[PDB]
Amino acid sequence: GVVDILKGAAKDIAGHLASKVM
């Protein structure tokens, strides 16, 4: 599934941003 990738690459970023506020 190609979407699965795009869905990860995108959220893969929110992970780092979450660390900043966390």
Curated annotation (Swiss-Prot):
<dbReference type="InterPro" id="IPR012518">
    <property type="entry name" value="Antimicrobial15"/>
</dbReference>
<keyword id="KW-0929">Antimicrobial</keyword>
<dbReference type="GO" id="GO:0019836">
    <property type="term" value="P:symbiont-mediated hemolysis of host erythrocyte"/>
</dbReference>
<dbReference type="GO" id="GO:0005576">
    <property type="term" value="C:extracellular region"/>
</dbReference>
<dbReference type="GO" id="GO:0050832">
    <property type="term" value="P:defense response to fungus"/>
</dbReference>
<dbReference type="Pfam" id="PF08110">
    <property type="entry name" value="Antimicrobial15"/>
</dbReference>
<keyword id="KW-0878">Amphibian defense peptide</keyword>
<protein>
    <recommendedName>
        <fullName>Ocellatin-LB1</fullName>
    </recommendedName>
</protein>
<keyword id="KW-0027">Amidation</keyword>
<dbReference type="GO" id="GO:0042742">
    <property type="term" value="P:defense response to bacterium"/>
</dbReference>
<comment type="similarity">
    <text>Belongs to the frog skin active peptide (FSAP) family. Ocellatin subfamily.</text>
</comment>
<keyword id="KW-0964">Secreted</keyword>
<comment type="function">
    <text>Antibacterial peptide that inhibits Gram-negative bacteria A.actinomycetemcomitans ATCC 29522 (MIC=222.37 uM) and E.coli ATCC 25922 (MIC=114.04 uM). Also has antifungal activity against C.albicans ATCC 18804 (MIC=233.55 uM) and C.lusitaniae ATCC 56936 (MIC=233.55 uM). No activity against the Gram-positive bacterium S.aureus ATCC 25923. Shows virtually no hemolytic activity towards rabbit erythrocytes.</text>
</comment>
<keyword id="KW-0044">Antibiotic</keyword>
<feature type="modified residue" description="Methionine amide">
    <location>
        <position position="22"/>
    </location>
</feature>
<keyword id="KW-0295">Fungicide</keyword>
